[PDB]
Amino acid sequence: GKELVLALYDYQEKSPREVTMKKGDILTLLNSTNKDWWKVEVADRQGFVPAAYVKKLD
C-alpha cells in the first residue's frame, strides 16, 4: 500500500500483529483487503488496526 489514512482515534495494540496509533496520525495503508483489520505503517512500525478507526485521505 502507498496511500495514506488518518487515525480517527487512539488505538493501543492488543496482540502481536497489531500496532499502536494516536488520533491525528497519518499512516500508510499497507493492506485493506480485510473488512475489519487494515495493515498500516505508523512512523516506522507496521501492524493491524481496526479499519473503522482510520479514514482514507483519498
UniProtKB/Swiss-Prot annotation:
Superkingdom of origin organism: Eukaryota
Residue ranges of every copy of the SH3 domain listed in the record: 1-58
Location(s) in or outside the cell: Cytoplasm, Cytoskeleton; Cytoplasm, Cell cortex
Family listed: Belongs to the spectrin family.
Function as written in the Swiss-Prot or TrEMBL entry: Morphologically, spectrin-like proteins appear to be related to spectrin, showing a flexible rod-like structure. They can bind actin but seem to differ in their calmodulin-binding activity. In nonerythroid tissues, spectrins, in association with some other proteins, may play an important role in membrane organization.
Subunit structure, interactors included: Like erythrocyte spectrin, the spectrin-like proteins are capable of forming dimers which can further associate to tetramers. Interacts with ACP1.
Protein name: Spectrin alpha chain, non-erythrocytic 1
Organism expressing this protein natively: Gallus gallus
Covered range of the whole protein: 968 to 1025 of 2477
